[PDB]
From a paper:
In contrast, hSOD1 must be in the disulphide-reduced state to complex with hCCS. Without the Cys57-Cys146 covalent tether, the hSOD1 disulphide sub-loop can adapt to the presence of hCCS Ala231, mitigating repulsive effects. As a result, several strong hydrogen bonds are formed across the heterodimer interface that are not found in the SOD1 homodimer. Particularly important is the hydrogen bond/salt bridge network between hCCS Arg104/Arg232 and opposing hSOD1 Asp52. This provides a mechanism for the molecular chaperone activity of hCCS. Thus, hCCS-SOD1 molecular recognition and complexation proceed by an induced fit mechanism reliant on the conformational adaptability of the hSOD1 disulphide sub-loop and hCCS domain II only. We suggest this primes hSOD1 for reception of copper and the disulphide, before any interaction with hCCS domain I or III takes place.
Superoxide dismutase-1 (SOD1) is one of the most abundant human proteins and is an important part of our antioxidant, redox signalling and respiratory control mechanisms. SOD1 folding, zinc and copper acquisition, and disulphide bond formation can be catalysed by the copper chaperone for SOD1 (CCS), which forms a transient heterodimeric complex with SOD1 to facilitate its maturation. Here, we discover the mechanisms that govern SOD1 maturation and stabilisation through interaction with the chaperone protein hCCS. Combinations of mutants yielded crystallographic structures of full-length hCCS in two different conformers complexed with hSOD1; an hCCS domain II truncation complexed with hSOD1; an hCCS domain II homodimer structure at higher resolution than previously available (1.55 Å); and the hSOD1 disulphide knock-out mutant used to promote complexation.
Author numbering:
A (entry chain A): 85 to 232
B (entry chain B): 1 to 153
C-alpha cells in the first residue's frame, strides 16, 4: 500500500459524512465515501490545499492546485489536483460514491481539507467567470481534514 | 509544511485552537494556542498516532510512538514522539498554551501532520507513576477535546 487516509466531513449544518482514500497504485487512488444531509441533486467535491478549520470551511483556501492548472472535471487532464467533480445525493439526501483518480495522490493531500459544496460543479463548462476558477458550485457546506 | 493548525472540539465545553510552526528542517516546532472550558490545573497534551476519529479515541489510537519507546515527558529522552507534557488551565478554565519541541516535526518520519491532538482529563505524570499505565498514557485520563492537525497557510 502507498497510503491511506480518511476525512470526516462536518459543517455548521445538517451535512456530515465520511470519505476514505486508498492509494491503490502509484498512479491510481481510490476514493469512497458516504455523505448525508444533502439536498437531492449534484454537489461539487473538492480537495482544498489547507486543513484549516478555524473559520468554518472558509480558511481552507482554494482547490488544491499545485500544478497551476485551471478548474475542470475529473475527466479533464487540465484540472486542479483537488477537482473531484460532482457526487449525487438521492431523494433521502444520502450521497454514496466510489471513484478512482489518476492525479490526486494520498501522500500529497494528508493534512489538507475535503469540502462538499451546495451546488453543482460545472466542470469548467458553465461559461461563467467562476467556471475556470471554482466551478461555480456556490457555498461550502461541510469540510474535514484528510487524516492519517 | 512550515505551519499547521488544529481545532480542538469535544462533547463537553472544552474547545480551543492550537497553532504549529517550524522554521528549521527537523528543528524546533513552536506549539501555541488557547483552550477554554477546562478545569483548573494541569491537563495532558498528546499527539496520538492516527487522525481517524470515526470511532473516536479507539480509532485515534495510542500516543504517536514511531520509535517504540515508553511514555515520558517532553524533556525526557525515553518518550513517545507525541508526548508533549501538560498544559495549564487557569482559574477561569483558559489554558494559554506555548510549547517548543524538537522531537515532533512537520516533516519526515516524525511528522505529526494529519494526526490527532488531544487534551486529556487528568494531568500527565510524565511516565513516573509507578504503574504500567504511567508507561502508556501517563494516567492522563479520557479525551476532553480532540482535533486533526492540518496544513495551514
Ligand atoms: Zn478546481
Ligand atoms: Zn506517551
Amino acid at each position: 500500500n502507498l497510503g491511506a487516509a480518511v476525512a470526516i466531513l462536518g459543517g455548521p449544518g445538517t451535512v456530515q459524512g465520511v470519505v476514505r482514500f486508498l492509494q491503490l497504485t502509484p498512479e491510481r487512488c481510490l476514493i469512497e465515501g458516504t455523505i448525508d444531509g444533502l439536498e437531492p441533486g449534484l454537489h461539487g467535491l473538492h480537495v482544498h490545499q489547507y486543513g484549516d478549520l478555524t473559520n468554518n470551511c472558509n480558511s481552507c483556501g482554494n482547490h488544491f492546485n499545485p500544478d497551476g492548472a485551471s478548474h475542470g472535471g475529473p475527466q479533464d487532464s487540465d484540472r486542479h489536483r483537488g477537482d473531484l467533480g460532482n457526487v449525487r445525493a438521492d431523494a433521502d439526501g444520502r450521497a454514496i460514491f466510489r471513484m478512482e483518480d489518476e492525479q490526486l495522490k494520498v501522500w500529497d493531500v494528508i493534512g489538507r481539507s475535503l469540502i462538499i459544496d451546495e451546488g453543482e460543479d460545472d466542470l469548467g463548462r458553465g461559461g461563467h467567470p467562476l467556471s475556470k476558477i471554482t466551478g461555480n458550485s456556490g457555498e461550502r457546506l461541510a469540510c474535514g481534514i484528510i487524516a492519517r | 509544511a512550515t505551519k499547521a493548525v488544529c481545532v480542538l472540539k469535544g462533547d463537553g465545553p472544552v474547545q480551543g485552537i492550537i497553532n504549529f510552526e517550524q522554521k528549521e528542517s527537523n528543528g524546533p516546532v513552536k506549539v501555541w494556542g488557547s483552550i477554554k472550558g477546562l478545569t483548573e490545573g494541569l491537563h495532558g497534551f498528546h499527539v496520538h498516532e492516527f487522525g481517524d476519529n470515526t470511532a473516536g479515541a479507539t480509532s485515534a489510537g495510542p500516543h504517536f510512538n514511531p520509535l517504540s519507546r515508553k511514555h515520558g515527558g517532553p524533556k525526557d529522552e525515553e518518550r513517545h514522539v507525541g508526548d508533549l507534557g501538560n498544559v495549564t488551565a487557569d482559574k477561569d478554565g483558559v489554558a494559554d498554551v506555548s510549547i517548543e519541541d524538537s522531537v515532533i516535526s512537520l516533516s519526515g518520519d516524525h511528522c505529526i501532520i494529519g494526526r490527532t491532538l488531544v487534551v486529556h482529563e487528568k494531568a500527565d505524570d510524565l511516565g513516573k507513576g509507578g504503574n504500567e499505565e504511567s508507561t502508556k498514557t501517563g494516567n492522563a485520563g479520557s479525551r476532553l477535546a480532540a482535533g486533526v492537525i492540518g496544513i495551514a497557510q
